């Protein structure tokens, strides 16, 4: 879950 | 919203690691002991028959 | 009594006083056989030489009497002998060994916890 | 005793007279070989090639477990 949340956060940063 | 979501994920991960560490350390400790009021003796003569 | 309900340890002492484990230490420290074999005049109440270990334990249990008071929770010990000084010394040794055993019972449970804590500290340090 | 009462003594009393302990004891000390040594008396010796149930009964006859109710103490003879 943490990995998925971090991936979403780093994808939506741009 | 994403900050709150990743904070929830981090909190879940840290509580899960704490739980697994606690279970691991509990699973190996010597919880219960057998105290010996009188240790086994070495007989000299025969009680039976 | 516990140094900061307690029938368990008095029962432990009641069992421990009449045990061969205490008798071995008592005979090694006070030479019970030599003292109890002295009165050659009467054969009914003396410890004959060459007797078995089991008979020695039976004789020692006959000489030392332990009584319980449950309503008051007190243990009274009467020790027989052929000299008064020897009887007093045997009673004192019995009390000292009883206290030492009572403390050692908890120290044994504590030592394994200490070893376990040391191992946990070692792995945490690593 | 618990390192930081009347149930563990029951578990021990049931466990001492169990086949699961008896097989370990035989694998460790070879009770079958020892209990068949005296050939002079036939009543109290363990005959060779006996049933496992009879071996368990013999082991329960030899080892004795006594418990002081008031005290919660278990004596094994």
TrEMBL record, chain B:
Domain of life: Bacteria
Name of the protein in its database record: Capsular biosynthesis protein
Native organism: Caldimonas thermodepolymerans
Full-sequence range covered: 290 to 338 of 370
From TrEMBL, chain C:
Protein name: Capsular biosynthesis protein
Coiled coil: 102-126
Shown residues in whole-protein numbering: 46 to 191 of 370
Superkingdom classification of source: Bacteria
């Amino acid at each position: 879950r943490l990995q998925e949340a971090k991936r979403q956060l780093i994808a939506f940063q741009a | 919203d994403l900050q709150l979501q990743v904070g929830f994920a981090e909190d879940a991960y840290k509580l899960a690691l704490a739980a697994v560490e606690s279970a691991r350390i509990e699973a190996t400790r010597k919880l219960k002991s057998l105290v010996v009021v009188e240790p086994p003796v070495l007989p000299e003569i025969a009680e039976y028959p | 009594r516990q140094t900061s309900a307690s029938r368990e340890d008095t029962c432990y002492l009641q069992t421990y006083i009449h045990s061969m484990g205490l008798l071995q230490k008592l005979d090694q420290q006070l030479k019970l056989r030599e003292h109890f074999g002295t009165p050659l005049r009467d054969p009914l109440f003396r410890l004959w030489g060459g007797t078995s270990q089991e008979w020695f334990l039976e004789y020692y249990r006959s000489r030392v009497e332990v009584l319980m008071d449950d309503i008051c929770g007190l243990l009274t010990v009467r020790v027989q002998g052929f000299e008064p000084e020897f009887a007093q010394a045997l009673n004192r040794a019995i009390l000292e060994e009883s206290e030492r055993f009572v403390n050692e019972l908890s120290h044994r449970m504590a030592r394994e916890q200490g070893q376990f804590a040391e191992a946990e500290l070692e792995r945490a340090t690593a």
